[model samples]
Target: VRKLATIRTAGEITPIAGAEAIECCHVDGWTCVIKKGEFKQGDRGVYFEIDSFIKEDNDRYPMLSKQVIDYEGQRGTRLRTARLRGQLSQGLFLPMDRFPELASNQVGDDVTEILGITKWEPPISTNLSGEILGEFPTFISKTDQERVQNLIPQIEENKGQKFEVTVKLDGSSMTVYRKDDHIGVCGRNWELRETATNAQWHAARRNKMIEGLQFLNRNLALQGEIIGESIQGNLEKLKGQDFYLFDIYDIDKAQYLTPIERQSLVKQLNDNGFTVKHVPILDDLELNHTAEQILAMADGPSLNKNVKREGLVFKRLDGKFSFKAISNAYLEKHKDR
Candidate 1:
């Protein structure tokens, strides 16, 4: 679960070029705009991340009366990416005094629930919803990568490390695994029960995911994004259903295979008549880019013609630490969503 709202001490306060009324405030690696004097360098406040749908509390957020946004099955004012006078802003920060009920909470405390904030998830197509087997398995860890903004320290600590960059696809995430004799297909939130119309199972069948796992007989999980019809407006303009594998996790070992091993396994599968494709790789080099620099590089053409891809993911060679840079350009384009 994402911490939609939390208390964070404000970091550096930098002046935006040609702007005097508002300035950029850093919290962790996120840069959101705050009033020029609203916060000193060390004050703390409740910071709401992008994709948060905050319930209306007139007294709390009078300025956010922007509009009612329907998300996560309800009506609330959605907080998303914005540009203030040519300066990019990604979240909202309000003084801690507003939430008297949560005033005593320490910094870094997850106050999302107390503040009535929920993340806005993209709608899953009915074809992918499939019947539910249960909650996402606790046995295999779910796939997640924190936004690069918050992981700046981790990135900086490994400045010279080798890392691979993969294009971030704009599609629904899915996981298919064969642990021993049982095979399961899961959407982001649930383990979908096998149904013919289900897109996940459909992809599994078409991609030979079941056969590939059965042949290997390893307790492993294949995680990736499922694109094509009824998904993300088929951004790639792919026909039918296509699954792009991005990760292969070993359940028994409780770790992801090394980058080389993952690539070989993908190659080995493809050679043996199992059609499998990994996410598009863009670069492999020693890390030299800062978070701000990487953020700037995320804007570009995607694999699809004329479509802005969802940023990039940087994975260290060991596959243990990685982070995603969501394209502010992409966010700006989809902000109305």
Candidate 2:
């Protein structure tokens, strides 16, 4: 796990604004209000909850608060009973290696590529590695697999390394690639062979917005998630099947923008005919203890009326890369089962 300077006591912990001399630096789940009391003064932890992006009945603030309250109330009842029975339920967790288990029964190679050039590699620059198996660059990039491997342990080691948290989205990786004087689109794993299969490319070309993205950077690869019903069905505030850009990976430059920058770029694209999802930052810590914080955002009344929530993603606001956990591997192993 992450090498810590303090004694080992693992669970989930959140940082408090005014506490000091705390040993634990990690927290568990989305609703981490319980651990806030243990942190050293001046230490801080993220408190993220989502607002219903698709709710037509309520505005953003009210929708977010309602979700936090609902989930917290449910958890409180469960925890109280467990405590009364002289047992305390633990949080959920999963190792990085176990993440791919969420995939269906069929197992295929991971599709991956470098930033700008056609040649693909792992996503991280660490010492971890991946096998070529029996395929060429078309299957999965060796680098991408290694990167995911690295992330698992990094997250496990950190266990409770405290920091701000954000919601991670479950969506497709869409890339606008410009390399060797060639501009095209590719999915997260492999470049789409069929021109029609690349929806983002079709829209970009149809709208004639390539010149701006490919203007200055010759080998630039912009990475993002394409959301809405057109691809995976509508999410909250994702009605009408719109495509919301969420990230940018500059291949040739070996650089990827933060979620904030990614959102800003998508906003610029929206000025044209294209549209993106609403990925906003927040200030509430009420729902920081439960994974339901993410679920509520997806399945709540504010989002798409017909979907069961595709899940949310979390990242740091400053774009710093750190791996923390909400639960443990024991829990992640059973997530889909």
Candidate 3:
């Protein structure tokens, strides 16, 4: 008997084993694999690390200031909450006084100087830089809510369609487009007319690993996030941020890569000095069965740890964007609140 691990995807996650070797059959030109772990198909409880990296928060918790020093050496459960109980009744742990160095401030000027936003200068998550890649077109200029609403229907229908569903980060949206005229940059909603360059974008551009999409395919647009202290000021955990590539909208082929294809592509991109989201598609039948049997899976974790457990994004395994999510009640509820 072999342990089976789950290989997560946008539509369905396949069970892999530890002893078997799995290789991607296509979409290898766009992605790079920086590291490989020991996991095989048909293995249960197998966690194949897809080189997932989370951006760190730079802002300190406004409420959690100062720490008790008594529990520094005690190594049992480390769950001592005797001190300052009344003050933190809402339930939050404070860093120890010795961890003062961990206290971070707003990201610095060098972070956003290039973008020239004037107000928001975020920090760089990793040591990243590269020449300017291409840019993405204005896919949708509507508000975030509008875009999400549009996605709901696509999610519901895209099942078993083989789409790559990248995890939407809480950071800024970034796109590197290659136009005949010049390279342009843009945020989530606003597409800059001028050379909308930012410090983080510049850093990402400078990274040797992030090769120009034009250089690879000549007609693809790379879309990702410039995540780090700059986006949310790292108001949660960890230090620094990372770039998570999502779309490689190909103008020549007139199509997008499938979820499985995107996974392989992102690995290549990361190997080239970029980071990618940890979104894996699920099988339609499996997802449906799981959701039906386990209601808790649909509700997601309602925690304040700054995680993106809002819900899952479904897509076709074939890289078409026509599918949608049937349920938007949860997303709609949080739209205004």
Pick the lDDT winner. 1
lDDT of 1 by residue, 135-242 (tens): 888877787888888776777788989978888887788899987778999888788888787788899998998899888879889999988877778777877888
Q: What is the C-alpha RMSD of each candidate to the true structure, in Å?
A: 2.2, 16.5, 20.1
Show the colliding residue pairs in model 1. 131-193
lDDT of each: 0.83, 0.36, 0.35
* Superposed Cα deviation of residue 323, candidate 2 (Å): 6.2
Clash counts for the predictions, in order: 1, 56, 71
Q: Flag regions of model 2 displaced more than 4 Å.
A: 1-169, 197-200, 203-209, 215-218, 233-241, 267-309, 322-337
The residue-by-residue lDDT of candidate 2 on 1-337, one tens digit each, is: 1111111123444343444322223323222223324343333322121111111223312322432323322311111101112222232111122224323322222211110102111222221123111222231221121111114334444444333333333345655556666666555544543354346555555444456465445455555555555544233445333333444555555665665666666666566544434434333222233343333343221133343333334454444453222222212232221
Residue 22, model 1, lDDT: 89
RMSD of 1: 2.2
| Lowest-sum lDDT 10-residue window in model 2 | 75-84
Q: By descending lDDT, how would the candidates be arranged? A: 1, 2, 3
Q: Which ranges of candidate 1 are over 4 A from the true structure?
A: 16-19, 70-75, 126-130
Candidate 2 CA-lDDT value: 0.36
Candidate 3: RMSD over Cα atoms? 20.1
